[PDB]
């Protein structure tokens, strides 16, 4: 259908690739396959090498694989058609990335990125195309996140039963998260304020609050409380935060908040919902959830 192409500065080496988003399946990875077109006359090194690199910019390299496109030492269903259309002067190359390697991620002004390069070695003879490693969301949900505590003080002789829960663990990007909060204060202190937040843990560590919701609800002594909140973490209010873990982007396009890291070097990203009660000595509770992208169907 479509094939992204990038011609080398001399126009002899023209890299062609079917896609540029290689999805890191949990068990395996998609094969990075392409074809390099060469002009035998221009080919003075008699050797063209294609590499698939995974850099951790800030340089560090985590996976370098070399395959000799020419001279010959199989072909994917797309490679054969591409060669047939482009003639007989094009030679195919393929890489099979192994699991346990990171997925593309950037830091909002870096991170782990991938690249496919081709060069004739025995500037003009060097063509580089940027690709991305990314992952979908788990196809099935996990157990409901429920978290309860009981914080007591010396003055009071009864528990302050705090509890929180989410409606599910898999929350796609741009989806509101409902945070069911319950309190039961048999103590004497006044429950001044309530806070709910969605926060990111990105370990290369830092913790930026992506979503916040502060309520002045007050629970009088010896009383219950139940309330459903709603937070939507998106990038509209997260553009002045340096160091935020953004998903990987090809050149400069705006992208969404980094997905979860389904499970290793690189940067590991996960998200947690926190419910906090500021009392007149503030109680807290946390739960995990999965922020990712769906799978087209």
């Amino acid at each position: 259908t479509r094939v992204f192409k990038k011609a080398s500065p001399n126009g002899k080496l023209t890299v062609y690739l079917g896609k540029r988003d290689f999805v890191d399946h949990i068990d395996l990875v998609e094969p990075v396959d392409g074809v390099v077109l060469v002009d035998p006359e221009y080919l003075k090194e008699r050797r063209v090498y294609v590499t698939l690199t995974c850099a951790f910019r800030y340089r560090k390299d985590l996976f370098v694989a070399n395959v000799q496109s020419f001279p010959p030492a199989p072909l994917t269903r797309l490679q054969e058609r591409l060669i047939k259309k482009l003639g007989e002067h094009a030679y195919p190359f393929t890489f099979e990335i192994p699991p346990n390697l990171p997925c593309s991620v950037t830091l909002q002004p870096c991170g782990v990125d991938y690249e496919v390069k081709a060069f004739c070695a025995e500037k003009r003879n060097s063509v580089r195309l940027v690709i991305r490693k990314v992952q979908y969301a788990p196809e099935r949900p996990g157990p409901q996140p429920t978290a309860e505590t009981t914080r007591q003080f010396l003055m009071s002789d009864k528990p302050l039963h705090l509890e929180a829960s989410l409606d599910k663990e898999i929350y796609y990007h741009g989806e509101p998260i409902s945070v069911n909060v319950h309190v039961t204060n048999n103590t004497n202190k006044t429950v001044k304020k309530i806070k709910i937040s969605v926060r990111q843990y990105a370990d290369i560590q830092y913790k930026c609050p992506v979503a916040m919701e502060e309520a002045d609800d007050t629970v009088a002594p010896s009383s219950t409380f139940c309330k459903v909140y709603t937070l939507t973490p998106f990038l509209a209010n997260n553009r002045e935060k340096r160091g935020l873990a953004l998903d990987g982007k090809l050149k400069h396009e705006d992208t969404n908040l980094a997905s979860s890291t389904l499970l290793i070097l690189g940067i590991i990203v996960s998200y947690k919902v926190k419910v906090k009660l500021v009392v007149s000595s503030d109680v807290a509770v946390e739960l995990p959830f999965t922020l990712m992208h769906p799978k087209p169907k």
Binding site: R2, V3, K5, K6, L82
Partner: peptide, 7 residues
């Protein structure tokens, strides 16, 4: 820049 073609 990433050019463009067909198949």
């Amino acid at each position: 820049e990433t050019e463009y073609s067909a198949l």
